[PDB]
Design a protein around this ligand. Structure first.
Ligand code: NA
Ligand code: NA
Ligand code: NA
Lengths: 154, 154, 154, 154, 157, 157
């Protein structure tokens, strides 16, 4: 039992009631890696809402938060800006490894993802890009890294 | 629709009627990549049985065969030795990319997998290691590569 | 036609009217990637001059600016410092991929390049190191990445 | 002055008089790296002709032979089979590095190239894939490797 | 013939128990590896995992004209892991490619403290400073990666 | 407590001048690195760059029940570089991923003899055999890469 994890799905349509294509996948992958998943929170691609969702999880003592979406370059891709405000420190290695793995698998939104990763309070927070391939490959890359960091934070 | 796929699961306990963990996962991932999955064939870790299952798949005209397991180094891991004889041309780039990806993700049985990849008739054949993480990460790496090869073989 | 490109060559000897080696190469490579090259602007290694040349390029609506030189570590390599101020968002994945590629090819000024990559307005801006090998290998790495970003920005 | 080099262009159409799109490029890149280029030989995608062209260059004391084309998976891609017969020993590192670099640059014919590299007599022979991107990225990767091996062979 | 010497180096060991007189396991190793790469090693300085102490040790080396400072330790995520924060303050500019190469190499060798190291690399005055993680494998692998980079940077300076 | 020992190792130094009594620079280093990774080191055996001598040294180790043989040298492209040809003959199967990881790591660290090494890796009976290139940087970097791989292979055997 590695810890507690939360999925934050950053998508306007999903926030407004549409089917969630990312939450169950990330839940399945997190559960497989030994996490108990608190649930999935869906938020608009809005800086205030994203920050509030991340901060709420940190205050709540979650071990791992994985966000999905909002890491591209269109106007509304504000997940990295939001995440930057709430991090006490960055673990660049996590974002580099995820980008490196995405690029060589030809998953372009992962290879170029502006997503961040770091520690806020005692919580590891990681932004993943929104595509299903990005989600699968990012989690594959994250598995050994998250266990190590959470163990150190405990 | 990219083409037709078959899954071969190399495992003694499965071939004797224990629960199959890999077949449904590979099928899920194949279908997601746009393949129609003919089905899953479970085979003992027997050099001849493996080679005949693969050979039956080729003769039957399937576009992609993915095998799972029997690629380590115990006397029983005979998958690469089975597969070698049915291959007309090896595509070393697929096996290398699978291994390099496994290694950076800390997936040791993938990083050290002796699995082959190659063309048999008009069928692309790829051996994956048996761990769940090896299955996931190997399929993520193989996705852009299979599509290209099958396109080239059509 | 993928879009319009500008080349900025950061070099004192060139800005003073010596032969330009990089401009024609970058133009050849840009055109090959499907860009229309507006032209080459030669600038001194002056933090302000560089930043204004880049800024003029952005205001003029060009899709891709590639600069060459001034990304090492002498007091005179001020390209990244110029570029930082005009960037709205950094795309760290481009700079990382350029460096990792340079490093495995033994191209040290590329592997250690302090060059940035990011979005300014609707313009993608990328700093390359100044060696001929750095220009070639950086453009090979950038090709799939620029196309995707400009597509996303349109 | 690193040594003497020969370009072997493996393409049916080019052998039969069509414009050569690869020869001048490889010549330019070889010359840039310090080689004197003997010329370009164009051959059919035929095992006998390819072998004869490679062997002729070896007997002739060429330091480096770069072939271009015939490394894919269609029936007529027989460059690796031809090259295998004439090599005394393989340098797998060259083919791995070229494939690794091609994959992460999204150059699929390079990432999956079945091209070989090795020593025949005192000659380094390297098969590159046929696309212009493959040619450019392969040469970038080959530059430091060829100089090292040729120096050892002397 | 000192003709092929690359320059002067200093090792900074960031470790509390070492700062209080416990046997130093990192200093001699980094010294051996620096010397083998052609650096003349001034010595090893032990400091506590304390931002001011780390910062003072680095400033002294910079003021002293040392070409290469390699620190060892204090690059994880616990609260005492303050080497990067101490280092950032004294850097004039960062050389991202060094830290990226150390991490990428660490990750493929299964050296997790190296793969995740928040250690920085960059230039302060004319001094190259590189933070490595504390485990023995991080030190060894970090130095293997640093060898071809440091010498090039110092040459440029 | 010998509880966490991974297994027994042997070092084979392939070098002509060392085989004829010149100071061995590789044996002690590989021994140090093997011991640090949890291997108990039987010793170092020096042989000439000769196919029969190399092959005999390897066969003796295999017959002896050694878990890991690391050879050093004879992996380039000159005519005396015969370690891979000697090794291929005694291998039951190859573990391509080891040789690929050593080369990829060597290449990014600018260690060209490692990046281009024709050295093999594989299993002979119950013995893992890995050929490394001869330079000091190849030995160090090769071992950093081998550490997480060897222990896993031996466990499986
Ligand atoms: Na991956
Ligand atoms: Na490249
Ligand atoms: Na390494």
């Amino acid at each position: 039992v590695v810890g507690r994890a939360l999925v934050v799905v950053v998508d306007d349509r999903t926030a407004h009631g549409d089917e969630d294509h990312s939450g169950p996948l990330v839940t399945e992958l997190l559960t497989e890696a030994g996490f108990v998943v608190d649930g999935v929170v869906a938020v608009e691609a809005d800086e205030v809402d994203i920050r509030n969702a991340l901060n709420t999880a940190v205050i709540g003592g979650v071990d791992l938060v994985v966000s999905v979406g909002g890491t591209g370059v269109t106007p509304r891709d504000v997940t990295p800006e939001s995440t930057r405000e709430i991090l006490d420190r960055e673990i660049l290695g996590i974002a580099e490894a995820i980008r490196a793995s995405g690029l060589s698998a030809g998953i372009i939104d992962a290879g170029l993802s502006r997503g961040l990763a770091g520690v806020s309070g005692s919580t590891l927070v990681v932004n993943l890009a929104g595509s299903r391939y990005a989600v699968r490959d990012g989690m594959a890359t994250l598995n050994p890294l998250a266990a190590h960091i959470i163990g150190q934070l405990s």
